[PDB]
């Protein structure tokens, strides 16, 4: 709570370079072997994401939402359990907290009391709220596995005209590398101003005696973009071409 | 038959034919190469 | 216009509203029609000779 | 509760024309398509045409163009089916069916069925005959008695046991086409309390002639 | 010669609404022109072969 | 038809070759409105 | 418009309304008339081959 973990500490940014990534579905409007130009807040191509690692250096920092949000993390474990998005991160005014506890995703906008670091292995009580949001029902082991890396979840989180969307991506592959197509998943119409988010970890162990997992995670910002998208016969996009790039 | 759709408050005119592509399941409804609304998705079953 | 569609204009402003709408979307299909066919006209004149 | 009403036989000669008559209630007549399902037996199921009663446009079979003219009435709420020049393979039986339209078409709702014998033959009313063994060698506890209906045109023929007062222990068997007429037999097993106390009659009932014949055993 | 093409008043401009074409009436003769010189040009592409 | 030649053209004859007249109207029967089945109210009595 | 007469949109409407109504008709008879000056100057330009 008010004691941080022991391998926490400050770390420069470290970045890399996202290459086809980050291209999602506009519309659910189905369109088949035609050019498409559309106008949303997008990843632009030749950009910084930042480098960030879980593991004897972790560093977990507090970035504004108002640039966008793309997130992508190769884990096998699940040790991302979540998000935290709020404003001035107390119980006047509304904040939203993404948890899974493996089975169903809870989503509620309500008043959430904040510490420092919170951990799992958050906040004391919650109030005067009527959004409360049961996702499907689902089964993932949250124990380590062995072998290569199998899961890659690529998710855009953005408000448009006080609506929240989520878009969802998984497919098999600490450099990523190609094109990949997002698809839609949940609306939320919340409309609340979110300034800043933070991060959730989960925690381990065989104040500062437990021990995080061995993962990475990305984040960058979007921006205005007007991408050309290809289309095949099955609906999906296989190129993107960016209008200001090269 | 041609008749007058009214899909979800959008309206229409054609026939009802079998469909063979395969669309999203989020999909209310989507457009051919000509701009037009060519599919649709019923508002009371999951039906394309 | 808000929308393109022609059923959408009627169904959504007011019959006073929509008839301003629906004027200004021909106006639009008639001068997508004048570039059309003066273009036809003059490249068969260039074929022509 | 939607029901398909049909008559139960029609009798046309070959090269005349016959009419058929498929009745709809409980529901609006020009919301639905009407289908027509013959059944030949032994082939099975095969398919005659669809019409729009509302537009009056039909949709026929390759093989079917011209044997049949499709018409409805939607003062009465009747569809109708119109056969033109019917042939000795064309006797079977017809079907009319509602076909509801959500997703995939089915059929939802069927008719009484209507047999068409298409043939020259004229109406003749049944001769019917008693079968009693007339003695007994005691070596059943039971009582086994029977009719005998035959000389009848078309079928079926309705036959009962006392107006139908035993619906158990009774056997219906088909009829054997000979020289343009129909004979079929019927057995009934009673106990031996009961065959001196009631009398066992034979009550064959012919709907197409009208003519009711009763015998006793 | 060139590829004849043929464009429709009534189906490219209206959405076969009833509203559309009590409007398309008070315009005129705007696309009766248009129709008649695509004749015209169909005509002169055959002299041409 | 002949009469369906002098309304287009607008003139009392009709000289010799091949005229184009209109289009094909095919009318609409019935119409399809197709909506969901909710049983439930919504209370805007509540916020009135 | 509602009516075509330009003497008859000035003694009806109000002076607001009737500004709507003249300026509809001028932008209606100046693409005629430049349909007429594009039509003549390409036959003008047959003429001269």
């Known amino acids: 709570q008010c004691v941080n973990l022991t391998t926490r500490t400050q770390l420069p940014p470290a970045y890399t370079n996202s290459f086809t990534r980050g291209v999602y579905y506009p519309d659910k409007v189905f369109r088949s072997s035609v050019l498409h130009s559309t106008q949303d807040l997008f990843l632009p191509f030749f950009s910084n994401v930042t480098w960030f690692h879980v593991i004897k250096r972790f560093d977990n920092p507090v970035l504004p939402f108002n640039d966008g949000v793309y997130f992508a993390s190769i884990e096998k474990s699940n040790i991302i359990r979540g998000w935290i998005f709020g404003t001035t991160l107390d119980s006047k005014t509304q904040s939203l907290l993404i948890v899974n506890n493996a089975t169903n995703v809870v989503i509620k906008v309500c008043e959430f009391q904040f510490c420092n670091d919170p951990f799992l292995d958050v906040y004391s009580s919650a109030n005067n709220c009527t959004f409360e949001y049961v996702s499907q029902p689902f089964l993932m082991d949250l124990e380590g596995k062995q072998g290569n890396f199998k899961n890659l979840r690529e998710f855009v989180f953005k408000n448009i005209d006080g609506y929240f969307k989520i878009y969802s991506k998984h497919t098999p592959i600490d450099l990523p590398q190609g094109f990949s197509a997002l698809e839609p998943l949940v609306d939320l119409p919340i409309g609340i101003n979110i300034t800043r988010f933070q991060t959730l970890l989960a925690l381990h162990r065989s104040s500062s005696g437990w021990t995080a997992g061995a993962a990475a995670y990305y984040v960058g910002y979007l921006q205005p973009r007007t991408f050309l998208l290809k289309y095949n016969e099955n609906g999906t996009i296989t190129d993107a071409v960016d209008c200001a790039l090269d | 038959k041609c008749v007058n759709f009214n899909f979800n408050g959008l309206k229409g005119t054609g026939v009802l034919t079998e469909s063979n592509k395969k669309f999203l399941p989020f999909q209310q409804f989507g457009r051919d190469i000509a701009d037009t609304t060519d599919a649709v998705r019923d508002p009371q079953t999951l039906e394309i | 216009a808000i929308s393109s569609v022609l059923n959408d204009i009627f169904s959504r402003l007011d019959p006073p509203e929509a008839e301003v709408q629906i004027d200004r979307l021909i106006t639009g299909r008639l001068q997508s029609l004048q570039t059309y066919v003066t273009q036809q006209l003059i490249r068969a004149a260039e074929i022509r000779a | 509760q939607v029901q398909l009403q049909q008559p139960g036989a029609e009798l046309v000669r070959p090269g005349a024309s016959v009419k058929l008559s498929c009745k709809a209630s409980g529901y609006s007549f020009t919301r639905f398509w009407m289908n027509w399902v013959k059944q030949r037996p032994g082939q099975g199921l095969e398919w005659i045409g669809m019409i729009h009663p509302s537009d009056s446009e039909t949709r026929l079979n390759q093989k079917f163009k011209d044997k049949a003219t499709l018409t409805v009435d939607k003062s009465s709420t009747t569809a109708y089916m119109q056969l033109s020049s019917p042939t000795s393979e064309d006797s079977a039986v017809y079907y009319c069916?509602?076909?509801?339209?959500?997703?995939?078409?089915?059929?939802?709702?069927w008719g009484q069925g209507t047999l068409v014998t298409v043939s020259a033959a004229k109406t003749t009313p049944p001769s019917v005959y008693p079968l009693a063994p007339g003695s007994a060698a005691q070596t059943n506890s039971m009582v086994t008695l029977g009719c005998l209906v035959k000389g009848y045109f078309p079928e079926p023929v309705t036959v009962t046991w006392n107006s139908g007062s035993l619906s158990s222990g009774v056997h219906t068997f088909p009829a054997v086409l000979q020289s343009d007429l129909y004979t079929l037999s019927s057995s009934v097993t009673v106990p031996s309390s009961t065959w001196p106390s009631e009398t066992v009659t034979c009550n064959v009932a012919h709907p197409a002639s009208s003519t009711k014949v009763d015998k006793k055993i | 010669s060139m590829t004849k093409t043929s464009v429709d008043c009534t189906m490219y401009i209206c959405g076969d609404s009833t509203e559309c074409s009590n409007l398309l009436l008070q315009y005129g003769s705007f696309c009766t022109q248009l129709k008649r010189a695509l004749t015209g040009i169909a005509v002169e592409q055959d002299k041409n072969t | 038809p002949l009469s369906e030649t002098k309304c287009t053209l607008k003139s009392f004859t009709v000289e010799k070759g091949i005229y184009q007249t209109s289009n094909f109207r095919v009318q609409p029967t019935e119409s399809i409105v197709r909506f969901p089945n909710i049983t439930n109210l919504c209370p805007f009595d509540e916020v009135f | 418009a509602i009516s075509s007469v330009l003497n008859d949109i000035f003694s009806r409407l109000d002076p607001p309304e009737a500004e709507v109504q003249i300026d509809r008709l001028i932008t209606g008879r100046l693409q005629s008339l430049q349909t007429y000056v594009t039509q003549q100057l390409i036959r003008a330009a047959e003429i001269r081959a």
């Open positions: 069916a509602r076909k509801d339209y959500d997703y995939d078409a089915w059929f939802a709702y």
